[PDB]
Amino acid sequence: AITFFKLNTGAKFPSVGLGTWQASPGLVGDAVAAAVKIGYRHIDCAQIYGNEKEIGAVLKKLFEDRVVKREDLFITSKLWCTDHDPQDVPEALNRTLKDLQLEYVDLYLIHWPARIKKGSVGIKPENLLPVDIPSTWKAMEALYDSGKARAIGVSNFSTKKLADLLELARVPPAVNQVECHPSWRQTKLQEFCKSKGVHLSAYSPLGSPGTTWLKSDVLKNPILNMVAEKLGKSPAQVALRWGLQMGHSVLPKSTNEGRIKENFNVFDWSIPDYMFAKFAEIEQARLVTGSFLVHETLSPYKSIEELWDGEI
Ligand SMILES: NC(=O)c1ccc[n+]([C@@H]2O[C@H](COP(=O)([O-])OP(=O)(O)OC[C@H]3O[C@@H](n4cnc5c(N)ncnc54)[C@H](OP(=O)(O)O)[C@@H]3O)[C@@H](O)[C@H]2O)c1
């Protein structure tokens, strides 16, 4: 069925989470409510998504109304690039906790391996700062030690950056949340993660078709669509079930009730082995390049290639 994965802390991580990037403050509450009512037990959040207060207000209502108990939900949030200095780390989590109306998060992630100055809404390369992941991770470890974050992890870390952190960390990252879908399979990183006991969690598992500045080609892939037609499932369902069968969690985002439901119905069927093999020939390209962190003169990362340590 593949309904959860065990983290290196022992915690059960539900395998399908509701994504909330680009879910507006006006729509995200009803989306979270609908998702939890349908059976989702995992919500992927971030301070930078601009909607944690609205998520918190609905979580409060769901708990009060006895739809779910806090202990049965898995809530992830992420430390934004402005808040990597160790002094700023616990303040950043405390703001997220206040907004989400929680006493702890189940998972707290370093969102990207980069620092940015406070004080611009927009990102400009002038505001990029030198990076110090070991120092930031030590501050994350204190949040884990105190129970404010029951698990800590990273996001957008290449194999090399994750390896470098693992070599020196006291608390190993529980999760590395990265772009992963049939057009960006991440087999190298997944294998490394598995060997080290780190769970890989897939963002943009549908290829983020609603993002205007990305090509919308993942759910249109002919191999994927043939499998969908043969099994009587939607292209999104096939993409999601594929991810589960590859051994990673998936974080599909929707603000539409029907799609939220559709995306969760990925446990009562499977992609048969021979059909599954066909996915291996889908052309590969990374959609989310992290170009906002890349600059020839002003950044620790002079190119996209450097940001991903060649994983492009
Ligand atoms: N750590 C990171 O740096 C990072 C980066 C990117 C994403 N993420 C996380 O991962 C989540 C998922 O990634 P994502 O939001 O980029 O994209 P995604 O989940 O791959 O795709 C979401 C898009 O697909 C549409 N959609 C959802 N279900 C569908 C279905 N059944 N059929 C057809 N279209 C469907 C949505 O529209 P509707 O909303 O209208 O249904 C939306 O436009 C994010 O929301 C966020 O939580 C993290």
mmCIF file of N, CA and C in Angstrom, residues 93 97 103-108 140 143-152:
data_model
loop_
_atom_site.group_PDB
_atom_site.id
_atom_site.type_symbol
_atom_site.label_atom_id
_atom_site.label_comp_id
_atom_site.label_asym_id
_atom_site.label_seq_id
_atom_site.Cartn_x
_atom_site.Cartn_y
_atom_site.Cartn_z
ATOM 1 N N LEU A 93 11.590 29.528 13.922
ATOM 2 C CA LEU A 93 10.685 28.424 14.212
ATOM 3 C C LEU A 93 9.565 28.884 15.117
ATOM 4 N N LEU A 97 5.635 28.376 14.541
ATOM 5 C CA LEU A 97 4.789 27.712 15.515
ATOM 6 C C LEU A 97 3.606 28.588 15.927
ATOM 7 N N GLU A 103 2.665 23.672 19.039
ATOM 8 C CA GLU A 103 3.733 23.688 20.032
ATOM 9 C C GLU A 103 5.012 23.047 19.511
ATOM 10 N N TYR A 104 4.905 22.254 18.453
ATOM 11 C CA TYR A 104 6.067 21.626 17.815
ATOM 12 C C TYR A 104 5.709 21.392 16.358
ATOM 13 N N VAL A 105 6.726 21.300 15.497
ATOM 14 C CA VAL A 105 6.547 20.725 14.173
ATOM 15 C C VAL A 105 7.097 19.315 14.173
ATOM 16 N N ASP A 106 6.532 18.479 13.313
ATOM 17 C CA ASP A 106 7.031 17.121 13.177
ATOM 18 C C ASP A 106 8.350 17.066 12.392
ATOM 19 N N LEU A 107 8.564 18.009 11.485
ATOM 20 C CA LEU A 107 9.774 18.076 10.685
ATOM 21 C C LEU A 107 10.063 19.538 10.401
ATOM 22 N N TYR A 108 11.309 19.953 10.605
ATOM 23 C CA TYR A 108 11.765 21.285 10.251
ATOM 24 C C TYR A 108 12.986 21.160 9.355
ATOM 25 N N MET A 140 19.699 23.996 14.294
ATOM 26 C CA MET A 140 18.607 23.039 14.062
ATOM 27 C C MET A 140 18.654 21.906 15.087
ATOM 28 N N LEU A 143 16.988 22.714 18.262
ATOM 29 C CA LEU A 143 15.521 22.654 18.134
ATOM 30 C C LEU A 143 15.009 21.226 18.224
ATOM 31 N N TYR A 144 15.778 20.288 17.670
ATOM 32 C CA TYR A 144 15.494 18.869 17.810
ATOM 33 C C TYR A 144 15.647 18.442 19.270
ATOM 34 N N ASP A 145 16.760 18.818 19.898
ATOM 35 C CA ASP A 145 17.014 18.433 21.286
ATOM 36 C C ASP A 145 15.883 18.875 22.219
ATOM 37 N N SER A 146 15.323 20.055 21.967
ATOM 38 C CA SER A 146 14.295 20.609 22.844
ATOM 39 C C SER A 146 12.893 20.130 22.519
ATOM 40 N N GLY A 147 12.733 19.396 21.425
ATOM 41 C CA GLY A 147 11.409 18.918 21.027
ATOM 42 C C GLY A 147 10.561 19.902 20.228
ATOM 43 N N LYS A 148 11.090 21.086 19.955
ATOM 44 C CA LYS A 148 10.381 22.050 19.118
ATOM 45 C C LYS A 148 10.217 21.513 17.683
ATOM 46 N N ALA A 149 11.221 20.767 17.204
ATOM 47 C CA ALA A 149 11.161 20.074 15.922
ATOM 48 C C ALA A 149 11.425 18.604 16.211
ATOM 49 N N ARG A 150 10.438 17.741 16.041
ATOM 50 C CA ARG A 150 10.634 16.334 16.437
ATOM 51 C C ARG A 150 11.573 15.589 15.500
ATOM 52 N N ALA A 151 11.702 16.099 14.285
ATOM 53 C CA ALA A 151 12.716 15.656 13.323
ATOM 54 C C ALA A 151 13.231 16.902 12.621
ATOM 55 N N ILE A 152 14.495 16.867 12.221
ATOM 56 C CA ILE A 152 15.101 17.930 11.443
ATOM 57 C C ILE A 152 15.662 17.358 10.156
#
